[PDB]
Amino acid sequence: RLPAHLRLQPIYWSRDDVAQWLKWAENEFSLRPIDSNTFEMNGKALLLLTKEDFRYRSPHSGDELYELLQHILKQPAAGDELKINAACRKVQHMVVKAALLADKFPVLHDIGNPKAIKCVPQADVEWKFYDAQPCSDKAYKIEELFYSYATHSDKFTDGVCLFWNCNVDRYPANSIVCRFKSAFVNLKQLPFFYYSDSPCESHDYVPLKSATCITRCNLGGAVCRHHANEYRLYLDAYNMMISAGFSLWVYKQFDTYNLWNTFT
Numbered sequence: 001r002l003p004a005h006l007r008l009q010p011i012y013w014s015r016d017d018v019a020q021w022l023k024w025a026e027n028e029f030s031l032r033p034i035d036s037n038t039f040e041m042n043g044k045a046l047l048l049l050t051k052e053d054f055r056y057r058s059p060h061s062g063d064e065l066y067e068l069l070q071h072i073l074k075q076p077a078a079g080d081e082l083k084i085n086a087a088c089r090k091v092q093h094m095v096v097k098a099a100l101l102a103d104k105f106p107v108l109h110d111i112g113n114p115k116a117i118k119c120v121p122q123a124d125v126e127w128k129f130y131d132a133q134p135c136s137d138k139a140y141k142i143e144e145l146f147y148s149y150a151t152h153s154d155k156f157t158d159g160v161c162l163f164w165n166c167n168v169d170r171y172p173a174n175s176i177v178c179r180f181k182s183a184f185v186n187l188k189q190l191p192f193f194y195y196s197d198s199p200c201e202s203h204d205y206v207p208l209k210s211a212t213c214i215t216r217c218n219l220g221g222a223v224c225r226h227h228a229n230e231y232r233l234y235l236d237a238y239n240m241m242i243s244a245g246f247s248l249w250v251y252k253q254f255d256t257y258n259l260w261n262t263f264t
C-alpha cells in the first residue's frame with residue numbers, strides 16, 4: 001500500500017517526498033503526530049541514517065518508520081502503466097528530437113515501430129519504419145524485418161537508427177536506444193539532459209541551477225519560470241522511467257554542446 005505520489009524508489013525521493021511519507025505513515029499506522037521537519041532531508045540522505053538516528057529524531061515512532069522503509073526497499077511499489085507510458089513517450093520525444101537537431105541526420109530508421117507513428121513528427125527528416133510483426137492496419141508503410149546485427153550491420157548506415165524497446169542482439173553504432181551488457185558495445189550511456197527551444201516566459205519559483213537544463217534562458221544561468229517548470233516535470237518522467245528499469249544509450253558522438261549551439 002502506498003500513495004501514487006510515493007511509488008518511486010526512495011533513492012529518488014525529494015525532501016517534500018519524505019514529509020509526505022511521514023504524514024502518510026502517521027495515518028496508516030496511527031502514530032503519534034510528528035513535525036514534518038523531523039527528517040528535513042531528501043531520500044538519498046534518509047537512506048544513510050541508522051535505525052538509531054530514527055529513534056533519536058522520533059522517540060515515539062522512529063523504530064517503526066525505519067522498519068517501514070526497509071519493507072519499501074525490500075518490496076518496491078509498482079508504477080502505474082499509463083503514467084509510465086506517458087513518461088516513456090515524453091523521454092522518447094525529447095531524446096530523438098534533440099539528436100536530430102544536434103546532428104541533422106537526413107534519415108531515421110525506426111526499428112521496432114509497428115504503428116508507423118513518428119515520435120518527432122515536426123522534424124525535417126525522412127522517417128522510415130521497420131518491424132518484425134507490423135500492425136495489420138499500418139503494415140502498408142512498414143518494412144517487415146527482423147533486425148539482427150550479424151545480418152544487417154552493413155545496412156541502415158545512413159542517418160540514425162532508433163530502437164525504442166526493440167531488444168535486438170546487438171545495436172549498430174548509429175543508434176538511439178531504450179531498453180528495459182554486450183548488446184551496447186557500439187554505444188555509450190545517454191546522460192540525463194533537458195532541451196527546449198520553446199520561447200521563455202516569466203510568469204523562477206525555487207531558482208533552478210543545473211548545467212543539464214539546455215535552454216536559451218540558461219545561457220545566462222537564470223532559467224525562466226516556464227522552463228524551470230518544464231525541466232522539473234521532465235525530470236520526474238525521466239526518473240519514473242529509470243526507476244522502472246529502463247536505460248538509454250546513444251551513438252558515441254552525441255554531444256550536448258551541439259544543442260547549446262542551436263541558440264546562436
Ligand SMILES: CCN(C[C@H]1O[C@@H](n2cc(C#Cc3cccnc3)c3c(N)ncnc32)[C@H](O)[C@@H]1O)S(=O)(=O)c1ccc(OC)c(C#N)c1
Pocket residue numbers: 111112113114130131132133134145146147148164165166167168169180
Ligand atoms: C513497440 C515496442 N515493442 C517491441 C517491438 O519491436 C518489434 N521487434 C522485436 C524484435 C526483437 C527481438 C529479439 C532479438 C533477440 C532475442 N529476443 C528478441 C525485433 C527485431 N529484431 N526486428 C524488428 N522488430 C523487432 C516487435 O514486433 C514490436 O513491435 S513491444 O513488444 O511493444 C515492447 C514494449 C515494451 C517493452 O518493455 C517495457 C518491451 C520489452 N522488452 C517490448
Ligand SMILES: [Zn+2]
Pocket residue numbers: 199200201215216217218223224225226227
Ligand atoms: Zn526559458
